[PDB]
Write a protein that binds this ligand. Structure first.
Ligand code: 1TI
Ligand code: 1TI
Ligand code: PRO
Ligand code: PRO
Lengths: 486, 486
């Protein structure tokens, strides 16, 4: 036995640790800020990787592999780990482990691009990167080493590069919403939060109700011609004039797994959406001592064969030395979306008993109907997980008009949607003021408190003219989404 | 235009550089010993990765991801890169970048394994590793950073672990011989060349005729209980006695791509076996100015659709601004195994002209027969590439009886197969003596010269009794394969 015992709504940090440890998703490691990704989590990564990989291939993006090292000269042209020695011997100049690969890839782009016939150039890589913050890590969400993909494209015009930025952002919306059943908000980052050196940064943002925090889920940047100028990346049109290329950068990490875990989990542990579950259906035979155990197990194998013909991912837990109750809890903790139970009474009726992980509802299904009924049940579970999560997202955002509605909203663990003048100085003033007010409240009470922009959403509600900015009183420009954050 | 101009049989090093650069497989990089893997090579890696990944999954191996860092304490429990600083700040203790992950994974294994019901434990990861030799690199073959997979299993008995070692070695034989059409020899490493800390190391070895050198293609180790003792990895049987587990480690790298390139390439450039070619068939329309170009291109699209229904990977090069001659050479350099040409005379007859890359032989195929004929042609090209390579392997090995047949054989750029007493001191004496004799010959002549064991092959020819060892005159034990090497 091993059950989750912290409650998700009472001690959220302990609950999250129990849910990912007791389900065997992660293991700790002697170097702080790094975690081991065990197969139960890694299978989910492989599934979303396959999804995204297939979609970018349809766009003409190709995979590649660039070195993990970058020279001091190129990098600084900051949370970076430096290699200064090979064995006993001092490197003649220190080299960094990649935090991101713009400065690794771009010198090569400048060599490869000569003519408009070389554009567009579209590359991606799957690798890990290192960002060495000396603050406390969170499994999946903030770690010193993490797996990601990063794509990098170059175009003859700004408009084509922007079109690609938005197409990729839509793929990230599908990664979260269609595979992981996590609702996200598309938007533009503020000038203070956009990618250093870029022109415009787009994002999809997620929300964690139990601590009130927004979290950036993935990112797609219009670099414009800024990096082209730094690295001298130019092409000749068909008339022979040299022009800078226009570039994009975009990435998504194993952070997505953590967001999925927090979104769907419950007091019993993980709940994995059917579309990414490596086991969608666990078959548990009931194995009384005084029964025809061979016949029961034979029928479980037949059912498995039948379900796999419909591309359902099935595992039979025929372990003799554990009870069905033990098995129920074991696969509940691991988040398997459907359990199928089969005992001598079911065999006698030609049915199976099926229990859905999200709600506990049980069904009796004839064997003839099993494959289509289970297909529709998984699609219902997927949809239900998304819709419930989406309603929590919408309950979690307060539309406000002025600044002293902020702290009450933040104390409800909500995000705020507010008209903003988008002046860069005001974002830093707001972060400092909300941090300060959070400190005072902590002292009245017996993990940063600051509120920052999460994004300026693509979906703008009506902006009546004359609407003033909630903090400066200046004319508002757009509705901006703010909250505490990761 | 861009043609290979160094001849493979005259300046092999220049030829190999031209073949991988002009085909856009690799790009140089500012940190020596590291190379960029561009898509044309990376697609081949993805193909063999998919092959091997599917086969180990059938064995119950699961993928995982362990950190790239290892603490000094665990590592030293040597060509290793040390991180000693994050930004400006000194790490309290230096940490190494993984050269291999036994010391990273094994502490976790000791935590995870408790009972015989936890065995066997079978994990793999796809990642890169760093081995920081300060000698001159060779693209694909010997580099400071390379991609690989490494698998690690633990078993309740030696016999099961050995059975797994040999099953994996057979997968590596299939990786080389069935995907890459490269012949390899299975064998056991000598006691001096086996994995440090292991019990027995098995290998598949390849041979490069143009420089006479053997090269280890992949490796599968019986670690036995040695690492179990170091890391205290124990299980309880069903009677409650603690026993050490028995372990295996195995890996294969992007070195395989380089071996494939050297094996099949010719004076025109790369030749890629059909089973791993990302483009198997390139369709080149003939586009005379005074022709119905629309009809020709329409038929090329129809042919492409028809071939892809048979799972043939097809690209149409309909570029207007290059000649067919230019295109022929461009895709020859890149190693595409089949070219299909279509002009107005072919359209008028309902045929296409097909040219095979390995031999230059051309065929006229009716459109109705195209899919099955091309399928059989690709299988013939694959087989032909393997069989020709296998005959070069067999021409390259001399069976000898005594030591002064060694240097003449080595001067023919051959490997030698010799009866050996398998005493460890004699291997080091032989390496020093052959190195010395090679130096003298270099001075008479106007990249190490030493001969070492490559492996003790599983396929042993007859050993008449009384046969003495070719170097010590002591009783021979087994036939051993020796040569200059990478
Ligand atoms: C997994 C992951 C994911 C992400 N991000 C960044 C945005 C992005 C998105 N979308 C990417 C990269 C895809 C574009 C994403 O996924 C960032 C980090 C990270 O910043 N790690 C360092 C670290 C270690 C650490 F121990 C602690 C902290 C730490 C503690 N408190 N604070 C304030 C920081 C930070 N890590
Ligand atoms: C790609 C790759 C592959 C391999 N191996 C090793 C065996 C194996 C097999 N089978 C593995 C790892 C799978 C088990 C394989 O693939 C080794 C190296 C390597 O040793 N790199 C360091 C280096 C850098 C460098 F610039 C120069 C040298 C150098 C120059 N002269 N000499 C004598 C060395 C070495 N690299
Ligand atoms: O780190 C980032 O945010 C961008 C997107 C992936 C590559 N660099
Ligand atoms: O480096 C090696 O040879 C073994 C096999 C892969 C992991 N370690």
């Amino acid at each position: 036995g091993a059950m989750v015992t912290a409650k998700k709504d009472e001690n959220f940090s302990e609950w999250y640790t129990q849910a990912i440890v007791r389900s065997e998703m992660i293991e700790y490691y002697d170097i702080s800020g790094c975690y081991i990704m065990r197969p139960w989590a890694f299978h989910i990564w492989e599934k979303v990787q396959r999804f995204f990989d297939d979609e970018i291939k349809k766009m003409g993006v190709e995979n590649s592999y660039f070195p993990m090292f970058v020279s001091r000269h190129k990098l600084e042209k900051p949370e970076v780990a430096w290699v200064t020695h090979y064995g006993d011997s001092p490197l003649p100049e220190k080299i960094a482990i990649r935090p991101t690969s713009e400065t690794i890839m771009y010198p090569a782009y400048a060599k490869w691009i000569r003519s408009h016939r070389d554009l567009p150039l579209k590359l991606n890589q799957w690798c890990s990167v290192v960002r060495w913050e000396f603050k406390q890590p969170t499994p999946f969400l903030r770690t010193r080493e993490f797996l990601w993909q990063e794509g990098h494209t170059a175009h003859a015009t700004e408009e084509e590069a922007w079109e690609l930025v938005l197409d990729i952002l839509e793929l990230y919306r599908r990664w979260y919403e269609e595979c992981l059943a996590v609702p996200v908000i598309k938007g533009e980052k503020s000038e203070g939060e956009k990618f250093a050196g870029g022109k415009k940064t787009t994002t999809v943002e997620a929300f964690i109700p139990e601590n009130g925090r927004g979290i950036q889920a993935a990112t797609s940047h219009l670099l414009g011609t800024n990096f082209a100028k730094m690295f001298e990346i130019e092409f000749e049109d068909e008339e022979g004039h040299k022009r800078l290329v226009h570039q994009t950068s975009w990435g998504c990490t194993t952070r997505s797994l953590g967001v999925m875990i927090m979104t769907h989990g419950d007091d019993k542990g993980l709940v994995i959406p059917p579309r990414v579950a490596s086991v969608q259906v666990v078959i548990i035979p009931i194995l009384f001592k005084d029964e025809n155990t061979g016949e029961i197990l034979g029928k479980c194998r037949e059912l498995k064969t039948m379900l796999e013909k419909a591309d359902i991912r099935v595992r039979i837990d025929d372990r003799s030395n554990y009870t069905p109750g033990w098995k129920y809890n074991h696969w509940e903790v691991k988040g398997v979306p459907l359990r199928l139970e089969l005992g001598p009474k079911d065999l006698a009726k030609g049915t199976a008993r099926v229990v859905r992980r999200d709600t506990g509802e049980a069904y009796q299904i004839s064997w003839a109907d099993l494959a289509p009924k289970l297909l529709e049940l998984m699609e219902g579970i997927q949809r239900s997980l998304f819709e419930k999560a989406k309603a929590r997202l919408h309950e979690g955002i307060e539309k406000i008009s002025t600044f002293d509605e902020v702290m009450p909203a933040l104390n409800r663990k909500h995000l705020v949607l507010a008209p903003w003048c988008e002046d860069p100085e005001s974002e830093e003033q707001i972060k400092k003021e909300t941090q300060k007010l959070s400190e005072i409240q902590a002292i009245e009470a017996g993990m940063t408190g600051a509120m920052k922009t999460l994004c300026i959403p693509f979906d703008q509600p009506p902006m009546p003219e004359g609407t003033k900015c909630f903090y400066t009183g200046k004319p508002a420009k757009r509705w901006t989404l703010w909250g505490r954050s990761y």
